[PDB]
Design an enzyme around this catalytic site. Structure first.
Site, PDB file in Angstrom:
ATOM      1  N   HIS A 184       0.824  -1.210   0.000  1.00 38.31           N
ATOM      2  CA  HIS A 184       0.000   0.000   0.000  1.00 38.31           C
ATOM      3  C   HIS A 184       0.860   1.263   0.000  1.00 38.31           C
ATOM      4  CE1 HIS A 184      -3.670   2.384   1.504  1.00 38.31           C
ATOM      5  NE2 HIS A 184      -2.673   3.155   1.910  1.00 38.31           N
ATOM      6  N   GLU A 185       1.897   1.270   0.840  1.00 38.16           N
ATOM      7  CA  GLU A 185       2.761   2.440   0.959  1.00 38.16           C
ATOM      8  C   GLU A 185       3.564   2.672  -0.336  1.00 38.16           C
ATOM      9  OE1 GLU A 185       1.587   4.132   3.140  1.00 38.16           O
ATOM     10  OE2 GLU A 185       0.931   2.677   4.640  1.00 38.16           O
ATOM     11  N   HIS A 188       1.311   4.192  -3.019  1.00 38.63           N
ATOM     12  CA  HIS A 188       1.361   5.659  -2.956  1.00 38.63           C
ATOM     13  C   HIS A 188       2.632   6.152  -3.607  1.00 38.63           C
ATOM     14  CE1 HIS A 188      -2.115   6.471  -0.605  1.00 38.63           C
ATOM     15  NE2 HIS A 188      -1.711   5.781   0.450  1.00 38.63           N
ATOM     16  N   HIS A 194      -5.835   6.621  -2.556  1.00 43.38           N
ATOM     17  CA  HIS A 194      -6.746   5.672  -1.951  1.00 43.38           C
ATOM     18  C   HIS A 194      -7.946   5.375  -2.867  1.00 43.38           C
ATOM     19  CE1 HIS A 194      -5.163   6.657   2.326  1.00 43.38           C
ATOM     20  NE2 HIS A 194      -4.503   5.660   1.753  1.00 43.38           N
TER      21      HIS A 194
END
Ligand SMILES: CC(C)C[C@@H](CC(=O)NO)C(=O)N[C@@H](C(=O)N[C@H](C)C(=O)NCCN)C(C)(C)C
Ligand SMILES: [Zn+2]
Length: 251
Positions: A184-185, A188, A194
Protein backbone atom coordinates in the site's frame (compact mmCIF):
# COMPACT_ATOMS: atom_id res chain seq x y z
CA UNK A 1 8.62 -1.67 -21.05
CA UNK A 2 12.34 -0.87 -21.29
CA UNK A 3 13.96 -3.91 -19.59
CA UNK A 4 16.89 -1.57 -18.95
CA UNK A 5 14.71 0.65 -16.83
CA UNK A 6 11.99 -1.43 -15.25
CA UNK A 7 13.04 -1.81 -11.61
CA UNK A 8 12.81 0.66 -8.75
CA UNK A 9 15.87 -0.06 -6.56
CA UNK A 10 15.28 0.50 -2.80
CA UNK A 11 17.30 1.54 0.17
CA UNK A 12 15.62 -0.46 2.95
CA UNK A 13 16.31 0.62 6.51
CA UNK A 14 15.55 -1.40 9.63
CA UNK A 15 15.62 0.76 12.75
CA UNK A 16 16.73 -0.45 16.23
CA UNK A 17 13.12 -1.25 17.14
CA UNK A 18 12.69 -3.47 14.10
CA UNK A 19 16.10 -5.12 14.65
CA UNK A 20 15.21 -5.95 18.26
CA UNK A 21 11.57 -6.95 17.97
CA UNK A 22 11.31 -8.47 14.48
CA UNK A 23 14.97 -9.40 14.00
CA UNK A 24 15.37 -10.90 17.52
CA UNK A 25 18.59 -8.87 17.73
CA UNK A 26 20.04 -10.71 14.74
CA UNK A 27 21.20 -9.36 11.40
CA UNK A 28 20.31 -12.56 9.51
CA UNK A 29 16.72 -12.74 10.86
CA UNK A 30 16.26 -9.00 10.14
CA UNK A 31 17.53 -9.16 6.59
CA UNK A 32 15.76 -12.44 5.70
CA UNK A 33 12.39 -11.00 6.77
CA UNK A 34 12.85 -7.90 4.60
CA UNK A 35 14.34 -9.71 1.62
CA UNK A 36 11.37 -12.09 1.57
CA UNK A 37 8.80 -9.37 2.18
CA UNK A 38 10.08 -7.23 -0.71
CA UNK A 39 10.27 -10.25 -3.02
CA UNK A 40 6.60 -11.08 -2.32
CA UNK A 41 5.56 -7.47 -2.86
CA UNK A 42 7.67 -7.41 -6.07
CA UNK A 43 5.65 -10.41 -7.36
CA UNK A 44 2.50 -8.29 -7.00
CA UNK A 45 4.01 -5.32 -8.84
CA UNK A 46 5.91 -7.23 -11.55
CA UNK A 47 2.79 -9.29 -12.45
CA UNK A 48 0.58 -6.22 -12.71
CA UNK A 49 -0.38 -5.05 -16.21
CA UNK A 50 -0.65 -1.27 -15.59
CA UNK A 51 -2.54 -0.68 -18.87
CA UNK A 52 -4.39 -4.04 -18.81
CA UNK A 53 -2.26 -5.19 -21.71
CA UNK A 54 1.45 -5.78 -21.95
CA UNK A 55 2.71 -2.94 -19.81
CA UNK A 56 3.86 -5.28 -17.05
CA UNK A 57 7.19 -6.32 -15.62
CA UNK A 58 7.82 -3.20 -13.47
CA UNK A 59 8.89 -3.96 -9.93
CA UNK A 60 11.12 -3.34 -6.97
CA UNK A 61 14.44 -4.70 -5.80
CA UNK A 62 16.54 -4.04 -2.72
CA UNK A 63 19.85 -2.22 -3.45
CA UNK A 64 20.95 -1.97 0.15
CA UNK A 65 19.65 -2.88 3.59
CA UNK A 66 20.80 -0.64 6.40
CA UNK A 67 20.50 -2.22 9.82
CA UNK A 68 20.53 0.00 12.86
CA UNK A 69 21.29 -2.29 15.81
CA UNK A 70 21.05 0.33 18.50
CA UNK A 71 19.32 3.68 19.02
CA UNK A 72 20.90 6.84 17.63
CA UNK A 73 22.35 9.00 20.44
CA UNK A 74 21.17 12.59 20.22
CA UNK A 75 22.19 15.82 21.97
CA UNK A 76 19.42 17.35 24.13
CA UNK A 77 16.79 18.91 21.86
CA UNK A 78 18.13 17.10 18.81
CA UNK A 79 16.03 14.44 17.10
CA UNK A 80 16.77 11.48 14.79
CA UNK A 81 14.42 8.88 13.30
CA UNK A 82 16.41 6.11 15.03
CA UNK A 83 16.66 7.76 18.46
CA UNK A 84 15.43 5.75 21.50
CA UNK A 85 12.54 8.05 22.41
CA UNK A 86 9.27 8.56 20.56
CA UNK A 87 8.56 12.03 19.27
CA UNK A 88 6.75 14.38 20.05
CA UNK A 89 5.41 12.45 23.03
CA UNK A 90 8.16 10.41 24.68
CA UNK A 91 5.49 8.73 26.84
CA UNK A 92 3.88 7.03 23.82
CA UNK A 93 5.16 3.77 22.28
CA UNK A 94 5.44 5.50 18.94
CA UNK A 95 6.18 8.70 17.06
CA UNK A 96 3.46 10.74 15.44
CA UNK A 97 3.63 8.91 12.02
CA UNK A 98 3.82 12.02 9.83
CA UNK A 99 6.61 13.48 11.90
CA UNK A 100 8.54 10.21 11.77
CA UNK A 101 8.27 10.03 7.97
CA UNK A 102 9.46 13.68 7.72
CA UNK A 103 12.30 12.93 10.12
CA UNK A 104 13.44 9.75 8.34
CA UNK A 105 13.40 11.71 5.06
CA UNK A 106 15.55 14.45 6.58
CA UNK A 107 18.07 12.07 8.13
CA UNK A 108 18.49 9.89 5.02
CA UNK A 109 18.39 12.64 2.37
CA UNK A 110 21.94 12.04 1.14
CA UNK A 111 21.30 8.32 0.66
CA UNK A 112 17.74 8.85 -0.73
CA UNK A 113 19.02 11.11 -3.51
CA UNK A 114 20.85 8.12 -5.03
CA UNK A 115 18.00 5.58 -5.07
CA UNK A 116 14.57 5.22 -6.56
CA UNK A 117 12.96 4.87 -3.09
CA UNK A 118 13.94 4.65 0.57
CA UNK A 119 11.73 2.69 2.95
CA UNK A 120 11.89 2.59 6.74
CA UNK A 121 10.77 -0.60 8.53
CA UNK A 122 10.06 -0.07 12.22
CA UNK A 123 8.22 -1.67 15.16
CA UNK A 124 6.15 0.89 17.08
CA UNK A 125 2.42 1.09 17.75
CA UNK A 126 1.19 4.18 15.98
CA UNK A 127 -2.05 5.52 17.47
CA UNK A 128 -5.45 4.36 16.22
CA UNK A 129 -4.39 1.43 14.01
CA UNK A 130 -2.07 3.35 11.69
CA UNK A 131 0.43 0.95 10.00
CA UNK A 132 2.46 3.09 7.60
CA UNK A 133 2.76 6.27 5.54
CA UNK A 134 4.35 7.41 2.28
CA UNK A 135 4.79 10.37 -0.04
CA UNK A 136 3.05 10.41 -3.41
CA UNK A 137 -0.45 9.40 -4.43
CA UNK A 138 -1.90 12.00 -2.07
CA UNK A 139 -4.87 14.24 -2.89
CA UNK A 140 4.31 15.54 -3.97
CA UNK A 141 6.79 12.70 -3.75
CA UNK A 142 7.02 9.05 -4.60
CA UNK A 143 9.37 7.19 -6.94
CA UNK A 144 12.57 9.10 -7.95
CA UNK A 145 14.01 11.66 -5.50
CA UNK A 146 12.26 15.01 -5.74
CA UNK A 147 13.84 17.75 -3.67
CA UNK A 148 11.94 19.67 -1.01
CA UNK A 149 13.78 22.55 0.71
CA UNK A 150 13.30 22.21 4.45
CA UNK A 151 13.20 25.79 5.86
CA UNK A 152 13.44 24.27 9.34
CA UNK A 153 16.03 21.77 8.18
CA UNK A 154 17.98 24.27 6.05
CA UNK A 155 18.84 21.66 3.35
CA UNK A 156 17.06 19.72 0.68
CA UNK A 157 15.39 16.43 1.63
CA UNK A 158 13.77 14.05 -0.91
CA UNK A 159 10.20 12.84 -1.04
CA UNK A 160 10.96 9.35 -2.39
CA UNK A 161 10.17 7.74 0.96
CA UNK A 162 7.68 5.74 3.05
CA UNK A 163 7.54 3.60 6.13
CA UNK A 164 6.00 0.44 7.50
CA UNK A 165 5.52 -0.60 11.13
CA UNK A 166 4.91 -4.35 11.81
CA UNK A 167 3.48 -3.69 15.27
CA UNK A 168 -0.22 -2.80 15.69
CA UNK A 169 -2.39 -2.92 18.84
CA UNK A 170 0.31 -4.46 21.02
CA UNK A 171 1.25 -7.33 18.75
CA UNK A 172 3.34 -8.29 15.75
CA UNK A 173 1.18 -8.15 12.62
CA UNK A 174 0.95 -11.33 10.44
CA UNK A 175 3.42 -11.54 7.55
CA UNK A 176 0.43 -11.56 5.15
CA UNK A 177 -0.70 -8.27 6.76
CA UNK A 178 2.80 -6.74 6.59
CA UNK A 179 2.91 -7.56 2.84
CA UNK A 180 -0.30 -5.57 2.36
CA UNK A 181 1.03 -2.54 4.28
CA UNK A 182 4.26 -2.26 2.33
CA UNK A 183 2.38 -2.90 -0.89
CA UNK A 184 0.00 0.00 0.00
CA UNK A 185 2.76 2.44 0.96
CA UNK A 186 4.82 1.68 -2.15
CA UNK A 187 1.50 2.03 -4.03
CA UNK A 188 1.36 5.66 -2.96
CA UNK A 189 5.03 5.97 -3.92
CA UNK A 190 4.18 4.57 -7.41
CA UNK A 191 1.40 7.23 -7.60
CA UNK A 192 -1.83 5.58 -6.47
CA UNK A 193 -4.32 7.38 -4.26
CA UNK A 194 -6.75 5.67 -1.95
CA UNK A 195 -9.57 3.75 -3.70
CA UNK A 196 -12.93 5.63 -3.23
CA UNK A 197 -16.21 4.07 -2.09
CA UNK A 198 -18.04 5.88 -4.91
CA UNK A 199 -16.38 3.73 -7.59
CA UNK A 200 -17.67 0.18 -7.19
CA UNK A 201 -15.20 -1.14 -9.73
CA UNK A 202 -12.36 0.04 -7.42
CA UNK A 203 -13.97 -0.77 -4.05
CA UNK A 204 -16.07 -3.93 -4.48
CA UNK A 205 -18.34 -5.44 -1.82
CA UNK A 206 -17.18 -8.59 -0.01
CA UNK A 207 -18.99 -11.06 -2.26
CA UNK A 208 -17.30 -9.50 -5.27
CA UNK A 209 -13.86 -10.21 -3.79
CA UNK A 210 -13.59 -7.35 -1.28
CA UNK A 211 -11.45 -4.23 -1.39
CA UNK A 212 -8.19 -3.64 -3.27
CA UNK A 213 -4.82 -2.86 -1.65
CA UNK A 214 -5.19 0.96 -1.86
CA UNK A 215 -8.48 1.02 0.15
CA UNK A 216 -7.92 3.42 3.08
CA UNK A 217 -8.97 0.90 5.79
CA UNK A 218 -6.65 -2.00 6.67
CA UNK A 219 -6.02 -9.88 3.52
CA UNK A 220 -8.09 -13.03 3.21
CA UNK A 221 -10.21 -11.71 0.30
CA UNK A 222 -9.25 -12.22 -3.32
CA UNK A 223 -8.83 -8.54 -4.18
CA UNK A 224 -6.91 -7.55 -1.04
CA UNK A 225 -3.47 -8.17 -2.51
CA UNK A 226 -4.19 -6.66 -5.93
CA UNK A 227 -4.36 -3.10 -7.26
CA UNK A 228 -7.74 -1.80 -8.47
CA UNK A 229 -8.27 -0.39 -11.97
CA UNK A 230 -8.20 3.03 -10.30
CA UNK A 231 -4.73 2.39 -8.83
CA UNK A 232 -3.52 0.96 -12.15
CA UNK A 233 -4.70 4.03 -14.11
CA UNK A 234 -2.96 6.41 -11.68
CA UNK A 235 0.28 4.44 -11.52
CA UNK A 236 0.37 3.95 -15.29
CA UNK A 237 0.18 7.72 -15.98
CA UNK A 238 3.74 8.43 -14.75
CA UNK A 239 5.36 5.02 -14.39
CA UNK A 240 7.08 5.08 -17.81
CA UNK A 241 8.29 8.67 -17.37
CA UNK A 242 9.40 7.87 -13.83
CA UNK A 243 11.00 4.67 -15.12
CA UNK A 244 13.13 6.59 -17.60
CA UNK A 245 14.02 9.04 -14.82
CA UNK A 246 15.31 6.60 -12.15
CA UNK A 247 14.41 2.91 -12.73
CA UNK A 248 17.16 0.42 -13.50
CA UNK A 249 17.76 -3.02 -14.93
CA UNK A 250 16.43 -5.91 -12.87
CA UNK A 251 19.27 -7.81 -11.16
C1 LIG B 1 -4.91 0.08 4.25
C2 LIG B 1 -3.72 0.95 4.58
C3 LIG B 1 -2.65 0.13 5.30
C4 LIG B 1 -4.13 2.25 5.33
C5 LIG B 1 -3.27 2.74 6.54
C6 LIG B 1 -2.89 4.25 6.50
C7 LIG B 1 -2.49 4.83 5.14
O1 LIG B 1 -3.30 5.44 4.42
N1 LIG B 1 -1.22 4.59 4.79
O2 LIG B 1 -0.78 5.24 3.60
C8 LIG B 1 -3.94 2.40 7.90
O3 LIG B 1 -3.23 2.29 8.90
N2 LIG B 1 -5.29 2.23 7.86
C9 LIG B 1 -6.33 1.96 8.88
C10 LIG B 1 -6.43 0.64 9.68
O4 LIG B 1 -7.07 -0.30 9.19
N3 LIG B 1 -5.94 0.63 10.96
C11 LIG B 1 -6.04 -0.45 11.96
C12 LIG B 1 -6.19 -1.79 11.21
C13 LIG B 1 -7.33 -0.18 12.78
O5 LIG B 1 -7.46 0.92 13.33
N4 LIG B 1 -8.31 -1.13 12.81
C14 LIG B 1 -9.65 -1.00 13.40
C15 LIG B 1 -9.95 0.41 13.94
N5 LIG B 1 -11.31 0.52 14.43
C16 LIG B 1 -6.89 3.25 9.62
C17 LIG B 1 -5.57 3.40 10.39
C18 LIG B 1 -6.64 4.68 9.09
C19 LIG B 1 -7.61 3.11 10.98
ZN1 LIG C 1 -2.61 5.16 2.31
Amino acid sequence: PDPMKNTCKLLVVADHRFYRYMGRGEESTTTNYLIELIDRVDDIYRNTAWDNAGFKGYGIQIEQIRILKSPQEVKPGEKHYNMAKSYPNEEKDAWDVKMLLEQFSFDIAEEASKVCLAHLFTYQDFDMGTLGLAYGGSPHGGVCPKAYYSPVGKKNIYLNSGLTSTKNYGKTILTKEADLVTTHELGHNFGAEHDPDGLAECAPNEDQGGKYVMYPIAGDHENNKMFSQCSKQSIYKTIESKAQECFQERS
